[PDB]
Amino acid sequence: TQINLTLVSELADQHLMAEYRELPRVFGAVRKHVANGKRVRDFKISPTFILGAGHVTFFYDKLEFLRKRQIELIAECLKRGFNIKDTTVQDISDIPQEFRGDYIPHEASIAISQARLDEKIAQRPTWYKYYGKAIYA
């Protein structure tokens, strides 16, 4: 799965939908972890936002930043007139306070995230739309 740091409102319709669908899976992985007896202390959580290998684990003690972003991904899907059937944030008050930390990206973290979206696009842009328009060349 992938988590972005960019303004959801600038997300290509396809990126908006995928994130929407994927972000929440982070909540379920942590529920699973906590049911096997794992705590934040048991994970290699990078000090800095990354893309490769420990990308998702990076958000394991940042579920509160994820929750607020979920809220934003739903609002942007309705705003565009997408028919999404899940319009409510996930209740994660059941997860121990330790994993529900916030987060605030540095413009340099964000830039990392923008370039990955940006190069996905340019791969084959006829495949991406913004509010169902092909503005990507």
* Active site residue ranges: 1, 22
Alpha carbons 132 and 80: distance in angstroms, whole number: 9
Residue 104 Cα distances to 6, 43, 59, 90, angstroms: 11, 20, 12, 20
3-state secondary structure of 75: helix
Are 9 and 29 within 8 A, CB to CB? Answer: no
